[PDB]
From a paper:
In this work, we used the C-terminal 70-residue fragment of PhBCCP (PhBCCPΔN79) as the template to prevent the N-terminal heterogeneity that was observed in PhBCCPΔN76.
Residue 138 is located at the perimeter of a crystal-packing interface. The wild-type crystal packing is rich in indirect polar interactions mediated by water molecules and a sodium ion, as observed in many other protein crystals. In addition, because Ala138 is located close to a crystal contact in the wild-type crystal, the introduction of larger amino acids at this position may interfere with the wild-type crystal contact, thereby facilitating crystallization in other forms.
Numbering used by the authors: 79 to 149
Write the structure that this text describes.
Amino acid sequence: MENVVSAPMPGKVLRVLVRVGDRVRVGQGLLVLEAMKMENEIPSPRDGVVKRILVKEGEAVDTGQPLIELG
Ligand code: NA
């Protein structure tokens, strides 16, 4: 899915760091997944604007699951 940031591993959503409409830059933390016994910031792969937030706190996600859509 183009413009979609997806989960790199299974985990639990701890918090979302951005809001719809936010400008983001490559490497910027978009949300935090608990996995591999740690808290992991999931980065933006590119500069952009946050278009949609596709998960909520507490949600269990799988590898490749859409997390954030960029505009
Ligand atoms: Na799930």
